[PDB]
């Protein structure tokens, strides 16, 4: 019933955040305070589009 569209491996490339879980939890509160706008934009996209392929950017 059709081919599933998938992104290329290059579109999925990004600079990774390679800190560990305890490092993330130590900075979690300030990180949620400072980086709120892009995070909320991505979550609104994710919950409105219902498709990970539409919110990669």
């Amino acid at each position: 019933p059709g081919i599933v569209e998938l992104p290329t491996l290059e579109d999925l490339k990004v600079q990774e955040v390679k800190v560990s879980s305890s490092v993330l939890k130590a900075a979690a509160h300030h990180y949620g305070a400072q980086c709120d706008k892009p995070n909320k934009e991505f979550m609104l996209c994710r919950w409105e589009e219902k498709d990970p392929r539409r919110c990669l950017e």
Partner: protein
């Protein structure tokens, strides 16, 4: 001319011997025991109330960390 020597009680008599039951009372009152129990329970309830409220706040903070990290 030796006199008769024989196992006999001492002159006068032996010291009196106790035989009646001796079970002392040895306790508090019922009211006091119950009162101590309820007082301990109330102290425990108050301590647990404070500690569980603090635990609720700490869990909220832990959950907010996850909410911040989720995106």
């Amino acid at each position: 001319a030796s006199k008769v020597k024989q196992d006999m009680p001492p002159p006068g008599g032996y010291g009196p011997i106790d035989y009646k039951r001796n079970l002392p009372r040895r306790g508090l009152s019922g009211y006091s025991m119950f009162a101590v129990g309820i007082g301990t329970l109330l102290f425990g309830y108050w301590s647990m109330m404070k500690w569980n409220r603090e635990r609720r706040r700490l869990q909220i903070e832990d959950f907010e960390a996850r909410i911040a990290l989720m995106p």
